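Forum: Protein Structure Q&A
Topic: Joint prediction for protein chains with partners

I've read a bunch of threads here and the consensus seems to be that you should model interacting components together rather than docking separate models afterwards. I'd like to see that in practice. Below is the full input, 2002 residues plus whatever partners are listed. Could one of the regulars post the assembled result?
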Amino acid sequence: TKRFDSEKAGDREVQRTMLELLNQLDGFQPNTQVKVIAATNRVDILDPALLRSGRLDRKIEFPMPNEEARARIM
Amino acid sequence: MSRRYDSRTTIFSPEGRLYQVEYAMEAIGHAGTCLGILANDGVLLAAERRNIHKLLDEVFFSEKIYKLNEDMACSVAGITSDANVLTNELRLIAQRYLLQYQEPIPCEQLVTALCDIKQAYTQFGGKRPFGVSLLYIGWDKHYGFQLYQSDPSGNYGGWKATCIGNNSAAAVSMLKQDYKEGEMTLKSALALAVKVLNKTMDVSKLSAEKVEIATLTRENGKTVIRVLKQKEVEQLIKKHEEEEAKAER
Amino acid sequence: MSVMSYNGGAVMAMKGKNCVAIAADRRFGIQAQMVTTDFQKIFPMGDRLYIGLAGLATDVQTVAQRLKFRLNLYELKEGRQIKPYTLMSMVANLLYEKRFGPYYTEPVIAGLDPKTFKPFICSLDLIGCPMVTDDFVVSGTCSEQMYGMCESLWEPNMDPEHLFETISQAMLNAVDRDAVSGMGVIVHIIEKDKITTRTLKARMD
Amino acid sequence: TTIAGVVYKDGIVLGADTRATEGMVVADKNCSKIHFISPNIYCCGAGTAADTDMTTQLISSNLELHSLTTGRLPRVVTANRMLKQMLFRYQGYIGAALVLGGVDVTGPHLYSIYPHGSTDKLPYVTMGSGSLAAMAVFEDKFRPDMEEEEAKKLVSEAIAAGIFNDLGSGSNIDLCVISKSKLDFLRPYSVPNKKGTRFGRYRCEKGTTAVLTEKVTPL
Amino acid sequence: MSRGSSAGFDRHITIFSPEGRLYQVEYAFKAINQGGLTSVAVRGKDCAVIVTQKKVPDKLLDSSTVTHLFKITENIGCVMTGMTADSRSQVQRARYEAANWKYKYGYEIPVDMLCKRIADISQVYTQNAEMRPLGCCMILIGIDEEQGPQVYKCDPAGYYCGFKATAAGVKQTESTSFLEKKVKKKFDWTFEQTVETAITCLSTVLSIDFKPSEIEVGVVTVENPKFRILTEAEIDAHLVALAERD
Amino acid sequence: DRGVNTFSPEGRLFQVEYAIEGHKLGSTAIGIQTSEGVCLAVEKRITSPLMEPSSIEKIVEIDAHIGCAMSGLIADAKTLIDKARVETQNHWFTYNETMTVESVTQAVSNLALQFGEEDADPGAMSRPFGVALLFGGVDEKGPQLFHMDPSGTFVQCDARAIGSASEGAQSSLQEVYHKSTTLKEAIKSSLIILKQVMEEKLNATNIELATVQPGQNFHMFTKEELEEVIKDI
Amino acid sequence: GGRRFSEGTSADREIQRTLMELLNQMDGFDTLHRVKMIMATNRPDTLDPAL
Amino acid sequence: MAERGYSFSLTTFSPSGKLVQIEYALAAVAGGAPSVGIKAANGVVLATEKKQKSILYDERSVHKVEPITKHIGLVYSGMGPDYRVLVHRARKLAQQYYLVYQEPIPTAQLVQRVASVMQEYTQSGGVRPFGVSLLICGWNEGRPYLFQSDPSGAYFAWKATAMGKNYVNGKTFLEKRYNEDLELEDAIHTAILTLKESFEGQMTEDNIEVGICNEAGFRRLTPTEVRDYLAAIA
Amino acid sequence: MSSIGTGYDLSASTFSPDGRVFQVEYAMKAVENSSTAIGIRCKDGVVFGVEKLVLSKLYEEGSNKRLFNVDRHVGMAVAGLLADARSLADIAREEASNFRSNFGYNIPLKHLADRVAMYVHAYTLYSAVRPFGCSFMLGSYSVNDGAQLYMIDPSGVSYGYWGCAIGKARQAAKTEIEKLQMKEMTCRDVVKEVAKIIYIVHDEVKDKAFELELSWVGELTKGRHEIVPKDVREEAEKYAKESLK
Amino acid sequence: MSYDRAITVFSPDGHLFQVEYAQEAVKKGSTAVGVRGRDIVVLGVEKKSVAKLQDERTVRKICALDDNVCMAFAVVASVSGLTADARIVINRARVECQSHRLTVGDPVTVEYITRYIASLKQRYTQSNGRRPFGISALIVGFDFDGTPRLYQTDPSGTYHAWKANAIGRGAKSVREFLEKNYTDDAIETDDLTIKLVIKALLEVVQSGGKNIELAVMRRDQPLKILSPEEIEKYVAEIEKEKEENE
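Posted by a regular:
Agreed with the consensus. Here's the joint model:
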């Protein structure tokens, strides 16, 4: 996660690695044809640069289930 | 509010004395020396005025000494913002008691009433105590002449000669030797008072602006509260330097 | 500065003027109903120690409200090293009586005092809870207001000294006590210099 | 009782009043201010009971102080009219106050009459007290709905003196309070007569037939 | 770091900080940009005009209902710029304040006074740690009862001052700069000219040029004290006028 | 941090869970109800017999036909019983009947939990009580003994013991007491268990005895009668 | 872009040095006759205060 | 309000002998624009410079010099938002005192009364301690008064004091040029010198304001007059 | 958002670096998780429709009330978590109840939507109480504006809508409303159509059964707000099932 | 006024935090001993640290709540507990003591006043925003049949009748030792009751017969506060008698 003003620690190997995904991810270096299946329980901790539509185009929800959905699993 | 911003501001310690109160004593130390000495016909307060700079209109009588009532006076050592809330209420309670009762206000009575408000802040409310220790000088028809001290917590002790401000510890020690509990006339008492300011204040030449001595003496059957004049303070200082040279070699 | 009734065994104030001094003369009377037992107890009070305010009627609330007013006068007197103005205190008293709302108990204030640090003569009476009363003439007040008013016109010496006003006033008080139950019961006469207060206590039942 | 009047002229108020407050024909007060300066553009005349009249004006005066200072633009007449009506009616009122409310708003001069109940009303010249009729008979004819201002000061001095002299509701002297719109003009001599007592020869007690009794210092 | 550092509890609630203002207070300024609205305020001498972007995020809205222009009194009109959540809430608070004067005074409240009562209100939020400061600012127009048309704006932290020209938005500093050159070169102000300055300045910085249903213009004219909504036909009229200036 | 007013991951309140364990530090309450009276035995909880038994109170009369013995956190209990005395008496005063043991028990149980550092003020709690009470008395229907605990559960009891070991105090009861038994055995059955639940001795200055019986008010045992019962183990 | 550091890690150690060199080539004693440099940034608030 | 609220103090002492937040507040008053207040002893002058820096302020009303009532005026230092409440507060107090005395609030008295409310704001929770310093002027009872009120609550009565940007330099110039009981001309001249000490808030007439209290009341000065006083200082 | 260990998402009197409270956003997910409420503005009245999920086969209509009758001409249809919906219902009822009784005429909606949203928002500001994690609509027939429908989000933002849906398939429902003209169409036809959108949303492979609550305030009832009459209610559902297939 | 979040809360430790801190704070303290006579019931404290520059007036731990009821408090701790804390418990009991005294026609029942005392320290433990005091008090008085009593409370409010009880320096330590000291033939005259109070206090007092402060109270006559010079004379008599025993 980028948000650093860290002069006290905070590694910044980790800073490079999130930034690098964007780099690969811009159109200049192809990524049109390859899909990335991204998964997170918390999108409540991420930033918009990594997420946000048209960088990872489709955004698929899975809301809580209901009785029929319970019915088929059982 | 929030409970993560709470580690309990108000709480009891197992050592029995609140963290915020010990922290407030250091602040009292910082402000200048305020003392009270007893006479066998008066009581007086001697304090160094917060101001020392050239610039001062001199609208108050002295920033430290507040003339509360016609038989009571107090001085403050510590936080001046904190001083204004206690001194204004003080002014009202001391005054109501002399005025109505026709019986001069005891220091012992006064302190217990004020200390209740100070204390409430330390035990509950999430608050913090006052930054000042106040020295009350007065005369009551009960005990006689008195001097009282109050502290941030709302703890009191009644002395008859005490000093607070910087070099407090040294001062009270000097005071024990020369004064016990009554032996000095109004003039010796006043000489003693100038002496304590002298050691403790950096400037040992002093000035009428730098220090202020206000006396309370019952003269001609009525209790008189007066701020001494710049001339009168200056005459006491001039008399004290001659005697300073001779006393300590 | 509302006092219960008027029955205080005496109610009378007279104030009379000179250019060299100004005087406020008062019953020193105490003790409610016809029966008195005492003839001493404060009623006129020095508030800057050189101005007076007189509060008039029954003892308890007269002494009580004066003192509670004294504390607000004092606040203003305390902070600055010069003391309050007479004109500003004059509306202050007017308001203090007014705070006690409609169908109030009747006091009768008399303020006598030279103005502080702007030097001109001042006499005023309040009564009820009423409109502003600044005068520079003369004022007499109480429930037997007419009887006092007569006397307040009577003493002015515009050119004699302070002393002649006192001796004139002693006769003025006495003749008034034979005319009403409001004067008398001992008389305190206050000649007020600006720098201090002189209290004289007159011989007269 | 009392004597209060206003006239409508170029500036907000020319006020006329006796100083004296009398209960019938006995003096309670030799001199007072019945037409008041509290501000210098809001002036208020008084009649009837002294107590009722003072509180009604003072309450408006406090609210006016806030508008004046924030805007730096004049006090609002309407605000004053509404405020005494609601506030004194709520209280239910100790007796009656005929009050003459007056301020120059943003527009022309507005003078109002708060009757003996408690109301907000609009005329343009008011007279108040038991002498409302008495003060009016001169005012209504000499003023013909705006006249020369200076001429109004001569005329009004003449009317005011007439109220004093013919009607026993006014001892001592007569006071005129003139505001153009922030002026504070006071002359308390709108009648010729001696102000207090006269002692050409000084005897008010025969030459020391009584003597000075005691001197004390009360410290 | 800075703008997110503990020094008391001042990056959480209002208390001063190492930055010489308050962190919590500064997020409340930062908050204005988020809403996405930008406003230009011009003070004429026949009207006082505010133009702000009207946030349209559906195509199932009725035009009349969806606005940010609110009638505070029949003398004062306003636009809300900043976060819309905070916008509705401040307006309801103001309304009670306008009404409170309205009965006592017996007349329409001055634009200066309306701004003074609300400004102080925004200060209570700011002084308190019980609630966070408003994410929005209310910018007032109105005919002052003698001074003339007046434009006052109260801050999201609540301080108010008078303006010839004001701007608040996403780009607060830049709109204000564009706006001083329009004032300097003085075309003068009629109904149409002053409205025209105001819209163009909002268009030039952001570099859009609008539909009349995505800007809103609100005026208080000396035709009548009552505040009006001009609606799309008259707003379109002003848009076309901008061409071939100055 | 979060409260004690929050739920645990168990799905139970944190503060109520702590309260029961708190009881275990202190005194015991043994009440045995027989059809000839309801007896209450409680420990004075002494450090020496040189501690006057003149006016140590821990079995106190709620009404003059209902007595109450307390167990658990003794300090918290003193205010709960003082309070309980006024409410029972408001009821006695209005109805003018002899109060039922079940009515006093229900009434005090809602006061147990009103805790919270929100939705409460100084007259309301900010902590749950950890006092378990045994109210024992005789009514119109006859002798009844009710047990109250911090979770507000009220239950009818023929013998209920709670103490320093709540569990301990009870296990002994099964062993000694039997359903239909005389008053005199009922008092004795309490002295044998009393020791078991205490970690402390049998002294006359360390136990306190009170009986509420038909036609007979709450009675406090004196030093001689305290000794008669100590003899009966 | 680095910070001022000197409480850093090895990763940070490297970052300040790249940062340092860029200043000296870009606007320093050395200059750029027609090479123009284009920077793309999502949020600039990680970069050194000199930059 | 419709919530539980706060009541815990945000200030805790230090084993230093200081209160932490008031020291951060003191930094904010220094970050202000220069405001000076001098009691001459022939009137009181409060002068300030106001950073508008665009002169797109049509203020014929609110300013950094705002009259509280007709013989009290107020000038601040620091930030505007904190000022807004204090200026309204002062007007309310002016009104309370106007009713009973009917001579608007005296300066010695005002400060004590503001000081008590300021102290609560530190002492209590759900409020915070200011970071504004007020300079209060008044002429009442035939004496001029100048007080300075600190963001803690403390009040000191001064002859001449400075706040705002570069106060340390200001107070030191003030001692040298100004000595006690000099003339109304000196008070005004040094007052404008402190603003000039360091300006940088757009040099046009409407960017400095002075308001003067004297025997006849208080009025704020037109910006054009203010500029003439400045013009002398190079 | 952030998941800081002290504040910001753990308080709500604290704004983020950007100026937003994360706590209202977490609440905004809650309307998405359960079933939809649709409500379209007519000009003769307003027609509301909330599908109430048959969770248990031992329920009857009036259970888990998503449809409230705010007054006798004001409706409230909610979507999201029912506990925050109830609070919002209670305030709305009192605000509407004082206005008919006192004034004597029907409430213009636009003010009402602003006041209730003020209530939502005032709580967001506070850290001592929570943001409301419901989205709800208010609908009224007035004699000052005619029909009005406003939708207030869990943030306290108010916008007027010709036709809204808030729930677990906003995108599918809004679009169906766009295609149709119901904006100024007669309330009677609308009843059938609102139900038919509910039918698309509902799945027979994510839900078993639902019980339709529609509410009238329109020309049948003569502007009186009642929950749908049993005959009408059935007719509208009957059409919804038949027309898909 | 009071703290919105509670100082005292049930947490897992068996009691409560503030009770727990409070038991520590009277344990680490100095000795306060009270012996129950048959003449006068007398209380005394180990420390006041008197040295002749100060005088006691209300400075006393022993304060009379009533004409025949008095309590001596030992707030007193590692670094000294608070006279500030004691005074509240004192103020509230004293008004209640006088109201009961008015109601009973013979000397006030101690019992009521001690039960009362216990509830005052407990109600703070249940009250929002508050915590209990860290005092232990020796409530003394005479009944309405004239029965002398010496009672004790701890910090959370629990009460017992006692012949003699001593608190502070480890409460258990000192009170078991006061049983040994105590004689019933040593309470038969007024000086002998006073001698038993003083012997427990001497044990570890720094500069004794000056720090030692004890006050006497009579049957319904007011408290007589003894000065330390007068107390010193008794202290000498026992301190020699005590030496003789070893």
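Strands of chain H lie at 35-39, 44-49, 65-69, 72-75, 134-140, 143-149, 155-157, 160-163, 208-214, 217-220.
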